[PDB]
Structure 1
């Protein structure tokens, strides 16, 4: 079980990076889509006010 845990430490190291990528991708996508839609609505509202 000591050697099994020595390898399992490395697996748990790699799953950390996988979970980091899988969380930051969802966060970045859902943020940037709403930022782009807000930019479109603002640039529209300038012309609508004119």
Structure 2
């Protein structure tokens, strides 16, 4: 029974942590994607302002 416990832990644990630690990547993607679009859109808008 504590065997089947360890397989269940490993399976659900592995799947969930894979999803969350990938969401870490989409998160840092959001971080520096916001940082880049900040100045990018900034220069389009300040070029269309004049």
- Fold in common (TM above 0.5): yes
Equivalent residue pairs, number: 47
Runs of 4+ with >6 A deviation: none
Post-superposition Cα deviations, 1:3-26, rounded to whole Å, max 9, x if no partner, equal 222321111011012112111000
Q: Which residue of 2 aligns with 1:13?
A: 15
User: Which shifted more, 7-16 or 37-46?
Assistant: 37-46
Unaligned runs of 5+ in 2: none
Root-mean-square deviation (CA, aligned residues, Å) is 1.9
Correspondence for 1:26: 28
TM-score (norm 2): 0.69
* Structure 1 segments unaligned to the other structure (5+ residues): none
* 1:2-50 deviation line (CA, Å, top 9, x unaligned): 5222321111011012112111000112112211211111222231xxx
